[PDB]
Write a protein that binds this ligand. Structure first.
Ligand SMILES: [C][C][C][C][C][C]SC1=NC([O])=N([C]C2=[C]N=[C][C]=[C]2)C([S])=N1
Length: 133
């Protein structure tokens, strides 16, 4: 019952600073535009120790599966090849991506009836709020 409050199908309801976050990450113009237009559903499931997170939109359908604390290689929606580790820290799922000497952290937390995603790259934070579908 690790992560139960995260499990489910979630729909994006608001975004702030995502274009600026993607700029800082290095996402190019055309991908930023089409990805910033995405209205993703985030689908989170658990089977034993394996957590799966899917992001589905008209831009891309992506899926990762992982065990907490155990690094994996990921291809991101914007085609970076990154090394990822996801942990649960005080109720927050913390996802760190490392590539080309850079790092970004994506945090997922439950707040009221929302799932709030905070994406940080150097000084820039984007907040992406989801509700149950
Ligand atoms: C750069 C990226 C792009 C994307 C595109 C599509 S939409 C979406 N997806 C996803 O997954 N998410 C989570 C994350 C991850 N990573 C990073 C950040 C975040 C969100 S909130 N949204």
């Amino acid at each position: 019952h690790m992560c139960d409050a995260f499990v489910g199908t979630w729909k994006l309801v608001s975004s702030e600073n995502f274009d600026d976050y993607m700029k800082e990450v290095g996402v190019g113009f055309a991908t930023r535009k089409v990805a910033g237009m995405a209205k993703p559903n985030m689908i989170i499931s658990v089977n034993g120790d394996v957590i799966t997170i899917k992001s589905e939109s008209t831009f891309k359908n992506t899926e990762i599966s992982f065990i907490l604390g155990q690094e994996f290689d990921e291809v991101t929606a914007d085609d970076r090849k990154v090394k990822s580790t996801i942990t649960l820290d005080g109720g927050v799922l913390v996802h760190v991506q490392k590539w080309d000497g850079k790092s970004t952290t994506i945090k997922r937390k439950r707040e009221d009836d929302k799932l709030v995603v905070e994406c940080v790259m150097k000084g820039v934070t984007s907040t992406r709020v989801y509700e149950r579908a």
